[PDB]
Design an enzyme around this catalytic site. Sequence first.
Site, PDB file in Angstrom:
ATOM      1  N   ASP A 156       0.824  -1.226   0.000  1.00  0.00           N
ATOM      2  CA  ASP A 156       0.000   0.000   0.000  1.00  0.00           C
ATOM      3  C   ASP A 156       0.864   1.285   0.000  1.00  0.00           C
ATOM      4  O   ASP A 156       0.501   2.301   0.612  1.00  0.00           O
ATOM      5  CB  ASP A 156      -1.015  -0.014   1.165  1.00  0.00           C
ATOM      6  CG  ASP A 156      -2.299   0.791   0.833  1.00  0.00           C
ATOM      7  OD1 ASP A 156      -2.507   1.159  -0.345  1.00  0.00           O
ATOM      8  OD2 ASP A 156      -3.081   1.097   1.757  1.00  0.00           O
ATOM      9  N   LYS A 158       1.966   4.795  -0.985  1.00  0.00           N
ATOM     10  CA  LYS A 158       1.359   5.996  -1.568  1.00  0.00           C
ATOM     11  C   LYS A 158       1.601   7.160  -0.590  1.00  0.00           C
ATOM     12  O   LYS A 158       1.848   6.919   0.593  1.00  0.00           O
ATOM     13  CB  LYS A 158      -0.151   5.807  -1.832  1.00  0.00           C
ATOM     14  CG  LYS A 158      -0.985   5.507  -0.586  1.00  0.00           C
ATOM     15  CD  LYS A 158      -2.436   5.253  -1.004  1.00  0.00           C
ATOM     16  CE  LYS A 158      -3.258   4.794   0.159  1.00  0.00           C
ATOM     17  NZ  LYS A 158      -4.663   4.658  -0.339  1.00  0.00           N
ATOM     18  N   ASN A 161       0.092   7.472   3.026  1.00  0.00           N
ATOM     19  CA  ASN A 161       0.463   6.546   4.079  1.00  0.00           C
ATOM     20  C   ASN A 161       1.837   6.827   4.673  1.00  0.00           C
ATOM     21  O   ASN A 161       2.330   6.008   5.475  1.00  0.00           O
ATOM     22  CB  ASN A 161       0.401   5.090   3.572  1.00  0.00           C
ATOM     23  CG  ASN A 161      -1.033   4.542   3.491  1.00  0.00           C
ATOM     24  OD1 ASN A 161      -1.980   5.155   4.033  1.00  0.00           O
ATOM     25  ND2 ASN A 161      -1.204   3.372   2.826  1.00  0.00           N
ATOM     26  N   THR A 191      -4.298   0.549  -4.039  1.00  0.00           N
ATOM     27  CA  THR A 191      -4.891   1.717  -4.654  1.00  0.00           C
ATOM     28  C   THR A 191      -4.597   1.696  -6.154  1.00  0.00           C
ATOM     29  O   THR A 191      -3.431   1.472  -6.544  1.00  0.00           O
ATOM     30  CB  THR A 191      -4.294   2.978  -4.017  1.00  0.00           C
ATOM     31  OG1 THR A 191      -4.373   2.875  -2.580  1.00  0.00           O
ATOM     32  CG2 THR A 191      -4.997   4.234  -4.495  1.00  0.00           C
TER      33      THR A 191
END
Length: 340
Positions: A156, A158, A161, A191
């Site tokens: 994850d 990105k 985060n 995502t």
Amino acid sequence: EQESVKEFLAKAKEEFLKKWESPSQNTAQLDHFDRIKTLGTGSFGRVMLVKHKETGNHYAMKILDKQKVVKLKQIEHTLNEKRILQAVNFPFLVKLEFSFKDNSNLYMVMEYVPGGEMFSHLRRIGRFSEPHARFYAAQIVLTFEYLHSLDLIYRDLKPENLLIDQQGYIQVTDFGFAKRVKGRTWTLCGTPEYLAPEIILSKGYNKAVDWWALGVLIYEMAAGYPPFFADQPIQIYEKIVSGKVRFPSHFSSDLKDLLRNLLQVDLTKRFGNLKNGVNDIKNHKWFATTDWIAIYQRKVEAPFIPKFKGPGDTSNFDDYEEEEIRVSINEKCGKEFTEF
Ligand SMILES: N[C@H]1CO[C@H]2[C@@H]1OC[C@H]2OC(=O)Nc1ccccc1
Ligand SMILES: N[C@H]1CO[C@H]2[C@@H]1OC[C@H]2OC(=O)Nc1ccccc1
């Protein structure tokens, strides 16, 4: 590789495995805390700033609704998240301080990082200079070297985060999709803008998907927008699998060369997934100014320090409707979450 790196990673794996095999449980309860503010929301949970009543310390408390976790098919993912967080330990990962559950919810109580998400600062400034992007990127390279050596995939990466701490360094939060993986794995998650081609194509995939995502992140930090974008995900997926990527003219030649090797659609040719592993990345020309030991030891002065007044300041996060934390009179989904 040097023997000091090999021995560092062997000790890191030893310490991870001892906690992995004997997880902690039930180390606080809800009425030990005062609720302050909601810091973010989602389909099955939210994150709130809280203050521990006896010590006065501030924390970020992630609250997951057990019935919504089951309905959205996230049971295994929520169990992965808490087991991994309670077992890891690395300078650029947020620390888990407490966990517990009750009749309705699961709770993970984390360090609070008051500087906010990297995404907010990127959008306020427009884009980061290459030295600024490279400072953040080096921390992600080291964090992935650590996680992958434990047989973990993060899944994850990105800007939302990556939190920025009081000294301007990264703290990675949200282990909701992380998993321990010997070989390949198959879940569709992430995502859309950051997904590797082999995820979109429903293949069995491995840690190479984190290195693809680092290519997307470095492009977005240096340009101000990600390389693949569109109004509908199907359109994003079509651009990703072509991998056709245009670079702004202000990109250095070294930056373009690195990005072509991270955003490589053939996973067997992608940097980070070759025989030399992470050292193809650490030894690339774009990182020639990086002192890898100094970054790890946090001895480099950061390019940017966030503005905030104190450990409880929320001015770098945004505003959400404040909702109740309800706890049912009756227990819900007890069987499904016994190990939590
Ligand atoms: N944000 C976490 C991680 O750093 C802080 C905080 O938790 C306590 C402290 O932990 C470490 O500095 N960890 C570490 C240090 C060197 C090698 C490997 C791990
Ligand atoms: N990290 C943010 C930005 O990228 C991801 C993620 O949020 C959703 C998606 O947003 C965009 O693709 N944004 C964009 C695209 C073109 C021009 C300007 C902005």
